Coordinates of C-alpha atoms in Angstrom, one line a residue:
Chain A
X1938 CA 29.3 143.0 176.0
X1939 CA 27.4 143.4 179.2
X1940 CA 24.2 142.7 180.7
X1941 CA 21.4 145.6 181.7
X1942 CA 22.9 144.7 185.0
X1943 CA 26.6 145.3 183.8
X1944 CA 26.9 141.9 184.4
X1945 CA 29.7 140.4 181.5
X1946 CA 27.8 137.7 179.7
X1947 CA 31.1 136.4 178.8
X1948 CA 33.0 133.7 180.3
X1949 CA 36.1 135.3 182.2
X1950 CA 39.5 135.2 180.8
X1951 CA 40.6 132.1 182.6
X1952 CA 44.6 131.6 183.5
X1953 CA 45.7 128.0 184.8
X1954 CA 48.5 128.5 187.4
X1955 CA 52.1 127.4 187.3
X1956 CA 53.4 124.6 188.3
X1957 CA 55.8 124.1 191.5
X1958 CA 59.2 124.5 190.5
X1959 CA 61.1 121.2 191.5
X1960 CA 64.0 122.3 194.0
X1961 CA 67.7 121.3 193.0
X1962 CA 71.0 122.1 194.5
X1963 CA 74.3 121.3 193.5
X1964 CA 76.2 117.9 194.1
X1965 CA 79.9 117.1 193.6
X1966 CA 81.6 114.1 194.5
X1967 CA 84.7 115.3 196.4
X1968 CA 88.2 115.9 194.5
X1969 CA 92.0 114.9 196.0
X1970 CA 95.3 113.7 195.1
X1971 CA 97.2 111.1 197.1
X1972 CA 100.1 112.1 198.8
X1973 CA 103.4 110.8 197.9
X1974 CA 105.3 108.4 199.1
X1975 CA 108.1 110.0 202.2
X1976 CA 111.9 109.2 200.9
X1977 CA 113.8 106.6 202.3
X1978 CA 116.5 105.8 204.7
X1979 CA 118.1 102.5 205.6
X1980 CA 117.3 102.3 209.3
X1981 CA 119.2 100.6 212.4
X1982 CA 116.8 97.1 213.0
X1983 CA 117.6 94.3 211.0
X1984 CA 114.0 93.4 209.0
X1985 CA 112.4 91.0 211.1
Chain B
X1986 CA 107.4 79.8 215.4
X1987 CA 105.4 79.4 211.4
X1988 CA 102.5 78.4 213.4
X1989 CA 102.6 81.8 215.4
X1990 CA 103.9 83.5 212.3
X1991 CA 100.7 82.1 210.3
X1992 CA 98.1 83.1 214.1
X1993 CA 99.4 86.7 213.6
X1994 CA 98.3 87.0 209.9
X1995 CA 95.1 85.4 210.4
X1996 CA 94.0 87.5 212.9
X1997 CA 95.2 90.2 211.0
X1998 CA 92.4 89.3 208.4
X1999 CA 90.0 88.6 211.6
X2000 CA 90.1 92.6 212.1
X2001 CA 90.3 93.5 208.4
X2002 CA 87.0 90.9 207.6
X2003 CA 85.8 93.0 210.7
X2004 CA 86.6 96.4 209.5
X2005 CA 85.0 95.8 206.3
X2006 CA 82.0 94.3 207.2
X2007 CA 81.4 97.6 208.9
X2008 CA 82.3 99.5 205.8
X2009 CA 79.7 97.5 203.7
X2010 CA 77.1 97.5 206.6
X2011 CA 77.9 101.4 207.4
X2012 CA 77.7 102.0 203.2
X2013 CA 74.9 100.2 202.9
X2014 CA 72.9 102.2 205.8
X2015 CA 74.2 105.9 204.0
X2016 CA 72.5 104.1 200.3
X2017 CA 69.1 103.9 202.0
X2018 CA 69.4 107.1 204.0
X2019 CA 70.6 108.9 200.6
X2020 CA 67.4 107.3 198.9
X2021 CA 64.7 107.8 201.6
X2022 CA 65.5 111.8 201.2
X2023 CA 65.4 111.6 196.8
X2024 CA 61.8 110.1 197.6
X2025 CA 60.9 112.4 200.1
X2026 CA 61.8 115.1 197.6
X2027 CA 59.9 113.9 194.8
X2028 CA 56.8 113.0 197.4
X2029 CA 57.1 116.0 198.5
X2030 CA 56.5 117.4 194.9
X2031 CA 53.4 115.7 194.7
X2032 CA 52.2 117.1 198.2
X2033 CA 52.6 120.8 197.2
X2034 CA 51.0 119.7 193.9

């Protein structure tokens, strides 16, 4: 479909680009148990 | 002696209205530091756009 020039008297084959990806990374909200309670011994002091 | 009893307990809650002011200021400054850097991100979007 060319010209006497070779020219293409087409339009070309156009090709819009991608988009830019969006970054993500990973988030966790941090995991733990409490820690028991120690065991239990009646001491020497009185309470106050 | 109550009297002294009752000083010691309110400025226990002195140091822990203290303690938690700081915790709500210092939270409150890691909110907007965490929220500047989301839109920074999704400016930043826009700029390589």
């Amino acid at each position: 479909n060319l010209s006497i020039d070779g020219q293409p008297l087409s339009l070309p084959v156009f090709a819009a680009p991608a988009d830019p990806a969006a970054l993500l990374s990973a988030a966790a909200a941090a995991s733990g148990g409490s820690k028991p309670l120690p065991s239990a011994d009646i001491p020497a002091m009185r309470f106050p | 002696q109550a009297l002294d009893s009752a000083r010691s307990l309110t400025g226990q809650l002195m140091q822990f209205g203290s303690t938690l002011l700081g915790l709500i200021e210092r939270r409150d400054a890691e909110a907007m530091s965490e929220l500047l850097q989301n839109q920074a991100g999704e400016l930043m979007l826009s700029s390589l756009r």
